[PDB]
């Protein structure tokens, strides 16, 4: 018997406005969700998720093996030593079902100063041929800025929830240097489904991806309407119901660090389900040099003894640790 997680739906529309009391009421709801299971659905968010899902499906279903090799990250193509993050993450027929395409800040061009300096975690996006995938790049870059805007608004809610001025986090989340990424993940229907792609949890549950905390400040996720996520509580894992009109939000481990675990990074995992579906996360990352001094909201003086952590060092170590723990995706 598996219970269902309490995942509230929060109308985030006030976070785009100037009614300050309404924004406080949203912040209270974010606080409550963040101290309970750690997940909530953002509704009334203003993003055209129907077009997002359609354009992503057209891409996943039309790209060919030749194109996948040409876009592949270094894990699948040793010629692409500069693609650690951005590019195509191939499936392996008979062994690995999931495949995905990851892209970063569209402002990271060859002329960008972080690219000129060869700073770790910064890469120039690779894209398919425009003639084979017309309008895909335009759509994907536009989507990045659309979800960037939603994420900026959410960060104002988190700041207010913790008793800070609304730009406390958002001031470090800038178009010129954000390390945020979009991943367009396809989970396919397969018959027979490769047994190598199913992991068995300690409790017997069949999984597609094992337990983890997110490498992010917050994670802003759109998924098609197939139930798959579970969140760990002290009484075991609970199912998160799907909603293909909303964005599922949770904190990552950088938030847990800077709040002395007041807002924990919820541990979650992905159940195996044999269904064609999409999982489209946006990982809200700050800039490479961004540092927020930790504080403890439980203490009157907010004092914390935790060391400030540069976001770049956090991200480089976190991404590698996640690969080592849960596998190359
Ligand atoms: C749980 C979902 C978010 C999704 N899982 C994921 O996206 C998992 C766990 S949060 N995330 C990752 O592998 C990190 C990708 C980081 C990305 N390459 C980058 O360079 O920024 C899934 O559906 O498997
Ligand atoms: Fe995650």
């Amino acid at each position: 018997s598996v219970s269902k997680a309490n995942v509230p739906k929060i109308d985030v529309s006030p976070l785009f406005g100037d009614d300050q009391a309404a924004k406080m009421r949203v912040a209270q709801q974010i606080d409550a969700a963040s101290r309970d299971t750690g997940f909530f659905y953002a509704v009334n968010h203003g993003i055209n998720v129907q077009r997002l899902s359609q354009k992503t499906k057209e891409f996943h279903m039309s790209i060919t093996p030749e194109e996948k090799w040409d876009l592949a990250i270094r894990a699948y193509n040793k010629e692409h030593q500069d693609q650690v993050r951005a590019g195509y993450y191939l499936s392996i027929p008979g062994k690995k079902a999931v495949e995905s395409f990851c892209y970063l800040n569209p402002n990271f061009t060859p002329d960008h100063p972080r690219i000129q300096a060869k700073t770790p975690t910064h890469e120039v996006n690779v894209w398919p041929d425009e003639t084979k995938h017309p309008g895909f790049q335009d759509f994907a870059e536009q989507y990045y800025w659309d979800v960037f805007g939603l994420s900026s608004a959410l960060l104002k809610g988190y700041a207010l929830a913790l008793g800070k001025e609304e730009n406390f986090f958002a001031r470090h989340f800038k178009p010129d240097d954000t390390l945020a990424s979009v991943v367009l993940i396809r989970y396919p229907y397969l018959d027979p489904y490769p047994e190598a792609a199913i992991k068995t949890a300690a409790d017997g549950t069949k999984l597609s991806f094992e337990w983890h905390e997110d490498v992010s400040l917050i994670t802003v996720l759109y998924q098609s309407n197939v139930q798959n996520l579970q969140v760990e509580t002290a009484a075991g894992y609970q199912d998160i119901e799907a909603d293909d009109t909303g964005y599922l939000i949770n904190c990552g481990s950088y938030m847990a660090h800077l709040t002395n675990n007041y807002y924990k990074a919820p541990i979650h995992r992905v159940k195996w389900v044999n269904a064609e579906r999409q999982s489209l996360p946006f990982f809200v990352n700050l800039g490479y040099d961004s540092v927020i001094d930790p504080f403890d909201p439980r203490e009157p003086n907010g004092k914390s003894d935790r060391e400030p952590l540069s976001y770049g060092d956090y991200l480089q170590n976190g991404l590698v640790s996640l690969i080592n723990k849960n596998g190359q995706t």
Side-chain angles (χ1 to χ4, degrees), residues 3-50 52-54 56 58-73 75-77 79-115 117 119-129 131 133-141 143-170 172-173 175-194 196-198 200-205 207-240 242-263 265-302 304 306-329:
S3 50
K4 298 183 187 301
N6 180 249
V7 182
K9 299 186 196 304
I10 299 174
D11 183 338
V12 297
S13 66
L15 299 175
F16 297 105
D18 298 311
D19 181 337
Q20 306 306 324
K23 290 156 74 166
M24 292 293 280
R25 295 192 291 275
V26 175
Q28 187 277 325
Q29 293 169 261
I30 289 168
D31 178 71
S34 298
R35 298 278 293 162
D36 185 19
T37 75
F39 282 88
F40 66 94
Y41 274 108
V43 299
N44 220 0
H45 47 68
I47 298 181
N48 184 345
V49 298
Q50 290 73 30
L52 171 65
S53 176
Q54 183 191 5
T56 297
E58 293 176 0
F59 170 67
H60 280 148
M61 300 305 288
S62 68
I63 190 171
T64 62
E66 177 176 34
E67 296 176 277
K68 291 179 184 178
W69 291 127
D70 286 340
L71 301 175
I73 60 166
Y76 301 98
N77 184 335
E79 302 186 24
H80 298 167
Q81 290 298 322
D82 292 324
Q83 295 181 233
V84 186
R85 298 181 69 192
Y88 214 87
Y89 293 54
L90 279 71
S91 57
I92 306 169
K95 297 293 187 177
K96 174 177 179 285
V98 72
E99 58 184 275
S100 63
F101 174 78
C102 175
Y103 61 105
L104 306 179
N105 191 331
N107 285 324
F108 293 166
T109 65
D111 300 334
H112 187 287
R114 284 295 187 185
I115 300 294
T119 310
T121 76
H122 302 75
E123 306 178 6
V124 180
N125 290 331
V126 297
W127 295 104
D129 176 58
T131 64
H133 297 267
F136 174 74
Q137 180 177 349
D138 283 333
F139 147 78
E141 291 179 347
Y143 177 66
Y144 191 98
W145 300 121
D146 283 350
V147 73
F148 181 99
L150 173 61
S151 295
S152 295
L154 292 173
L155 287 180
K156 296 180 181 178
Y158 277 97
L160 291 174
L162 292 158
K164 300 295 189 169
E165 58 92 17
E166 72 172 12
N167 295 316
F168 184 76
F169 298 113
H172 300 278
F173 185 53
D176 63 294
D177 71 355
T178 175
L179 293 165
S181 57
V182 176
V183 190
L184 310 176
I185 309 168
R186 178 190 177 193
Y187 276 98
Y189 176 83
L190 296 171
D191 185 20
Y193 204 100
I198 304 168
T200 304
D203 68 3
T205 305
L207 304 177
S208 290
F209 196 76
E210 259 283 21
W211 73 266
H212 64 287
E213 298 177 349
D214 280 2
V215 181
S216 69
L217 178 64
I218 64 170
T219 300
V220 177
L221 174 63
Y222 180 81
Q223 295 193 315
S224 51
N225 183 33
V226 179
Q227 199 280 319
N228 68 100
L229 286 169
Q230 297 187 315
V231 56
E232 192 176 38
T233 74
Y237 282 90
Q238 302 185 334
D239 282 331
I240 295 175
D243 185 340
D244 66 356
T245 71
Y247 277 88
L248 190 66
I249 317 301
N250 64 276
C251 292
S253 59
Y254 197 79
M255 185 69 81
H257 177 72
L258 76 96
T259 67
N260 199 25
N261 219 42
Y262 183 75
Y263 289 173
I267 290 171
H268 53 288
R269 66 190 186 181
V270 176
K271 292 191 299 184
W272 171 73
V273 184
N274 195 2
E276 185 73 45
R277 66 192 185 80
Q278 299 175 324
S279 186
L280 317 179
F282 180 64
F283 297 105
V284 177
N285 294 320
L286 305 179
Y288 188 80
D289 288 338
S290 300
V291 187
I292 298 169
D293 289 332
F295 61 103
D296 191 349
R298 308 176 188 84
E299 303 294 332
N301 55 19
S304 173
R306 290 198 168 179
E307 295 294 327
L309 182 61
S310 167
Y311 202 92
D313 297 315
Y314 163 81
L315 182 65
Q316 188 174 356
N317 178 83
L319 293 177
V320 174
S321 294
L322 189 59
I323 291 167
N324 286 345
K325 177 214 178 306
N326 283 17
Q328 177 62 59
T329 62

